[model samples]
Target chain A: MALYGFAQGLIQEAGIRIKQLMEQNLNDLVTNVDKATEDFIFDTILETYPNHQVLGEEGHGHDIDTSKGTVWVVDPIDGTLNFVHQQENFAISIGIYIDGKPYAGFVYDVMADVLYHAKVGEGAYRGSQPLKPLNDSNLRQSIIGINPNWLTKPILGEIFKEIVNDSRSARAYGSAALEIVSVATGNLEAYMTPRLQPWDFAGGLVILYEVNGQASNLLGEPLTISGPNSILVGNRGLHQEISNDYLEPHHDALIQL
Target chain B: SMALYGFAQGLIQEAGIRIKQLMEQNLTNDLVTNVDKATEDFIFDTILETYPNHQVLGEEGHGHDIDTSKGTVWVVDPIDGTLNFVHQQENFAISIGIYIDGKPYAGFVYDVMADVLYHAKVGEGAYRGSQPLKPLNDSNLRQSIIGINPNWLTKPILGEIFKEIVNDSRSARAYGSAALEIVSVATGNLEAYMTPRLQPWDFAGGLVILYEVNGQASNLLGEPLTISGPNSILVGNRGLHQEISNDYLEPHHDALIQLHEQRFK
Candidate 1:
């Protein structure tokens, strides 16, 4: 409980620090702010718990302890491209795990001031209000968030092309965490990426779990943010249907990307 | 047109307030039942009071049949990007375009949540808020950042062509709001924005806003927009528009111009 509360409060503080840094500098460069924000978050975590393991996207790359008692996985700024250019769609993603089990997580959309979070059994929420679990979506009616670049590839891309062609529509918001939240809240039917890091999926995974949303690799393999992985997060049934048709057959080539 | 612009500025604000009030309510799929109707009613009423004889058009079907060749025809989208409004509660806009004699005269695309109201007149130039929008520079297709739905890039029909666009550009973004995307082009935030299907109301308001800033708007084939029904749209600067149309997109040969090829030829 204490850890959950700490993560919740700390992420919001981290969000505030990010905006302050960007505002003070007019061009709002990426590397400086990325390191600064991650440093601030890691220092806070270290100060709060001297023994807790930390793995961060922009921080020092320490070999992760997968079976740790307390781990805070973080991506200081998930959509750096969007952040540096568009000034929107980026987020601060933080996931807490205890002994390899789900704990609490947060994906804070800094510019929008909207936070998607969960503490395992507490269910998912955006601010004070709880988010309803994803409704069972029809694959035909689904709206997906996937980049078009993937669909142009030779083998794997063609399968993705089919999945995208079948869905109701498609979007690519530039941030993986927020895209997962979109699936968690039932706004998007699914979100897939060829490659993403631990910090990107850490916070988003816990939030999706509470909503009964599924998060897995392209082949429905369980996710371990320990290494880069292809991802699909969305309604369980819809995930199954897509996997059966498009993902599983192309899984080998996809994981390599 | 200036008087009409003032009236539009006021009407959209009134409609904005109405929308803000509805934000407290839980959004459901039937947004058509609440926010859309309320906003359309208010805007329609506001327009009727000032110019009863002028034709008006709205997505909610509140206005009269528009005769663009005749008097003023106000094309309004009560809530553009209703999906964004339903899901994110942001990124949507209240769009209004005042057309005179079948051409754009004045336009408004107000980002209700962000407090950024974009407006423009035919030759007067465009404004994001109080400051006038800066003229866009010559854009390179490689250096350009476009606003496009990720889905279209993967679409079989559009994918082959748009994938080239996405890969060649600096990057791509989708806000799920047509008006916001169009306004982004005027603000120099996006070098271009394209969508496969958009109603006359959805693009009309933003089209004029784009036009005033010297931005280009066209169907995929580089033809002028014909607001008769649903149509494909591409909004950007003249340089990238020409380069992309002539150099990149046209070579794909997927019948992208199928929508307008026979008619134009």
Candidate 2:
């Protein structure tokens, strides 16, 4: 509970700073704001717990071992491009782990003033309202969050084409954390991208877990907190169905790593 | 004058209630559900009862052959973004545009799930609910976020044409709904939104709202968008629209002409 409260306060403060920075030359400010936000979060976290480790998108703790003591993973702005371009779809995300186990996660949508958070045993929440557990949603009528660029890739495109066409429709919001949280909130049935770093999904993964959502790499492996990996997440049944029907068949073609 | 705007607002709100109630009941799993058809029927019938002489052009086949240049015409899309409605049950909208002798008079786009109404009366300003929306500020394509359908970038011919625009712009987004995308531009959430193909009902209400906010709209070839038929759409704030049309699209004029003639014509 202490960690949850600390993360929520820090995430919202970062959101306020981001909103202030957005008023400048937006395109020029994104990189600066990204670093400044990460710096601010790092300073606050270290001040709160000097012995804890930090891993951040802007490289506060780039190579810290995830298997170590209380570690904090942060994405100051999950969608920097969206922050620069759209201004509304980006979020500030934070995930805290105790002994490399997920303890709490927070994703704050700055413009919308919505915060999604959860603790290990507590249920996930969108603001103060608890999120309902995700049910079994099939691919046939599901809305998938996928980037169009992925569809034009080599062998990966072939696999994604089938999944996209099989689904009801496709949407891409340009923010991985927001897309992942979309799945957690049931706004999107699934979201997949071939590559996302740890900070991008760390906060969203914890929130999704509390809602009984599933998260794994495209190759049906558990996602790790150490480095970049392909991401696939959805309602429980849809995740297995997509993995088996669309991905498993092209196992050799998709095994890039 | 106020009567038509009030009536259209009331009718769209009423239609929205029915849509929400119907979806709550979990009607169908198909892409296009009976909710769309029923909502259109309910709106069409209600409008005709109030104004018998006025004609309605609807997505569900109400006034297909009605001549818009002659008299009052109401163009409505009972459910824009039907795919979103069927799948996410959000981001879809009820759109209505009332035109007097082929010129936009009043327009409304109701985001049913959000219960937010974006509306405008020509000569008056646009409003998100009752608050007047500020006029769109000038934006450069390089600094702007354009809403675009990802599928357009996958086409062989259209994809090649749009590659430079997409690459040069800040980034792109696809919400899967033409009406809502247009509204995004009106509210300054997006600098521009374009697609190679859309119908009268998809953009009719949004166009009016865009005009109120000083946003510009035209076919990809720089022709004005008409409510009489389907068109390729490109809408943005005035400067971004002009920059894209003049700089990016003009160089590819011959190719766009060929594609538009072959497919869009």
Candidate 3:
């Protein structure tokens, strides 16, 4: 608990400082900011623990095997398009795994000034408020978050059609990390993506789990916590429905294997 | 040769410029304010003074409710998409329609911000500013962009209808204003604009403007729409209009009517 809390504070502070720097520079690219923040986090964590493995988005840390004692997955800026074009909908994400199991997570939405965090058995929270567990059987009355690109991808087209036919409505706001956080709060009933990297889903994976939701690869199997994977996070009922009816029939199409 | 249309174009431009200036000053209101009323009054008075006793229907109710079958009726929406004007400060229009004995004679939809005017007369060609509009080509669902409420795709009867449409179309959008969507159809920015309920004040001027460009508007049942009643409008080029009215709108309307009858019984 103590180590997790300390790491959380360091990650949050880094996020705030980067947000300030980005606002000042006004044209900061993902590669530059990603490198600077990743270096700072990797150095700070390694200096203290000296034994922990790190997986940074900008490729700053060691590539230790999955059997390592601890690995910190860092995505300094999620939603780089939003950062470049609109200056909104971006977040700083960090996830910690001990022995390939999620130990802690934090995602700071820089624009809205809200931070979503979770520890392995502690409930998910936005700032100080504990998030309520979402209702499970909301297929007939649920808002699903989806990317329109799925409609264009031939392998996922049928499943995408079924999702539209089933859900009350579907929206695409161009951010997967934020979509996962919104699912944690019951603001969105489900978030599905056929492909995403480990840094993108690692933080959101822990946050969703703390709220009684499940996050998995597109095949309905549990996600590999050490690195990048395809993802589906939702309340239990919709989660199962999507897994069984949609992803199952289309499992052959997933490029994961 | 171009003098009469040019004169009408000047009138619309003047109204558009005046409306734009008024919108810049006031950035909050639900309905059109006194500025809109005053602008419509000025246009109506100018037309009446020149034409002498021609019937008119300004959005602010300056003209009497006379029989439409008797003579020419001038319908005007001084500023359409008032919410966009107040919020985004873009994408609003001044729309005008001239109907002789309830048949369209001329129409104009002026986009104030872009300073582009779409105009057409009964037999003459439709135009965007000075250039003549091209004849509309045949379009399909996958080859087209449609405008509709996102909410309509999920709520039972409308949901089923919206699903069919979404499955067939290339994309869908909601721009929050009917008149602006109509002009989008005229300019080929969108293939069609479909909505269930509207008033004469909403589509009166836009309908005339659309006709000049060889576009059409009709009810969901594929019937010619009357401005005398509340409207279910589907506006597009001929191919799209016919296909949508046939494939999506008629079935949806039938299902709604069936549900209503069951409830009443």
Candidate 4:
């Protein structure tokens, strides 16, 4: 609880700075705010835990293999487009991984003031309430958050079509980390994107698993915490079903991209 | 003509406002609410009384279905993008089409929240309120911003067609409403929009409005879209429309047609 609260404070402070900076600047504000917040979180995490290595968006530090010691992966602003243009869907994400395993995670929807957090061996919580495990049976009745860019690629088109055919509806809310947290909290049934950097998936992965959900590559392969990769995260049933029936056949094509 | 257009505009605005209020109350998936039905009912009755002999085809199915090849026929979509309205509380439209002997004579698409009424008569130019819409110029594909389904780029049935467009066009956007996308083309915000499977209620009104601005909307064959068939619409200014339909869509259409034929027969 103490660590979670500390992380929240840091994230909130970073978010406030981002919001203020965004309000003040317009041209190239997205890139600037993203770099600014990323720097703040990276510096704060290192200052608090000097031994921890950091992998952050805005390309802060040297890439440390997740297999080595505790590594903090951060995305100061996950939805830069939303933050820059729309101001509606962005969030701050932080994940602490110990020897490649997530030890703790935090994703703050800065605009909404909603914080989702979890610690390894402890359940996930959205704000003060414990998040219920996602129910895959309800997948057909639920909305899926997807990026439109993935659908445009020919290699992933078949899988995208299958998902569209299966789900009741699909939407792209424009923020990857926030969408994953939304899935963990049951706001969405699943989130799939063909390409996401490590910092983008790190925070959401921990929160998702803490709520009995899972995040993997489109082929159902485990997401490598140390490297940028393609990803799919959802409840077990939908996750596995999409992997086996839709994504596996197209793995070769996706990997080529 | 202006007086009738004004009356039509007032009726559409009233209906649009009522729809918006109902939408704000329930931001969910189901759009077949009492207000949708009520608004259509009110508009249908009023228009019927004003043009007692005119045929009316409304979204809620409140009026008689007559053969629309001759005489005046009014096609109304009480709300387009009902899903967006019920969920996002924005981006819906009330559309009206007046056709004379199967040819469009007048059109109106009222966006309530944006407070922009796009309207036109057959011979007169299209307008947003009082400002006339200019005709689109033929430009390089890369200079154009097209409206497309996000799905097309990811899983193009006709291999790489979407990729070609994305690579060539300045950018692409999907606004989740057909009428609005068509209006974007009419006003030059977009050079073209290509979509498969739209209902008559979706584009009938927008078609008239686009035509008044010297724009065109047709099936892939460059033929006029019929009100009674499955709609595969491609609307753009003249040269882009011709270039896209002839140079881009035809080969894909042929491939799809062949694929379907081989599968079924």
For this target, which candidate reaches the highest TM-score against the unseen true structure?
A: 2
Q: How many angstroms is residue A229 displaced in model 3 relative to the true structure, after the best TM-score fit?
A: 2.2
Model 2 scores a C-alpha lDDT of 0.87
lDDT of 4: 0.75
Residue B47 local lDDT, model 1: 80
Model 1 C-alpha lDDT per residue in residues A153-244, reported as the tens digit of each score: 57766668778778777777778998998888877888898788989999999999999999888877889956778888879888988886
The best candidate in terms of lDDT? 2
Off by over 4 Å in 2: A16-28, A149-159, A241-257, B23-32, B246-265
What value does the lDDT take at residue B26 in candidate 3?
66
**Which segments of model 3 are wrong by more than 4 Å?**
A23-28, A255-257, B1-265
**Candidate 2 residue A132 C-alpha distance from true site, Å:** 3.1
Interface RMSD of each: 2.3, 2.5, 7.4, 4.7
* Model 1 lDDT tens row, B65-90: 55566778888898998867765677
List the DockQ of the predictions in order.
0.44, 0.43, 0.05, 0.12
Ranked by lDDT, top first: 2, 1, 4, 3
Candidate 2: RMSD over Cα atoms?
3.1
lDDT values of the candidates? 0.81, 0.87, 0.73, 0.75
- What tens digits encode model 4's per-residue C-alpha lDDT throughout A1-257? 56566777888899789768866735377787787778888888788788888888888757576788888889888876555434656788888788767788888888878888888879998888998877774456546777555555555656677776676556566678988987887766777888898888888889999888878887777897767777788888877777777677776777776
